[PDB]
Amino acid sequence: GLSDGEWQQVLNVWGKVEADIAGHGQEVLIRLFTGHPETLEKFDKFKHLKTEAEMKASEDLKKHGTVVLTALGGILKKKGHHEAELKPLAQSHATKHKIPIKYLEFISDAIIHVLHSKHPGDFGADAQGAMTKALELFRNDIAAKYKELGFQ
């Protein structure tokens, strides 16, 4: 788990996200899609996006980025006590959306990249350690639900 001090860092970093949730969400998804084009293919409603310019210009992508980061932020504020929030996300992503756990690894990495890119010099070594732990916990708890479903 995370220490209280680590959770405090996580939620302090998250305050940065909340100042522009759509902008952060958009950049995370663009980072995912551009670094790993296979992920774009899981989104019927974004596979029409052929270029990063089109991605950047997509208001619906920004909207989805808001949905995604709002869900994650709710989960993080539970500080690990997230079974009720996390279980349904794990199940929709395995059974409906067919998202292998690797892609959750990719988006976790994208979140770390975007934080540095949008806040250069303001996402310190302690903060990165804490956020990384929180994202691994999230990923690891999803992985447990995936195993339950025999998904992947």
Ligand code: COH
């Ligand atoms: C690589 C693809 C992949 C990844 C890594 C991913 C990772 C994450 C992630 C990790 C931080 C969070 C918090 C969410 C959160 C959400 N995702 Co996704 N999602 C993904 C593919 C999808 C797809 C596909 C949909 C449906 C989009 C649509 O058509 O509306 C989706 C829908 C959602 C929804 C809408 C409700 C639902 O369908 O369950 C939420 C909330 N999610 N997602």
Ligand SMILES: O=N[O-]
């Ligand atoms: O982009 N995650 O749904």
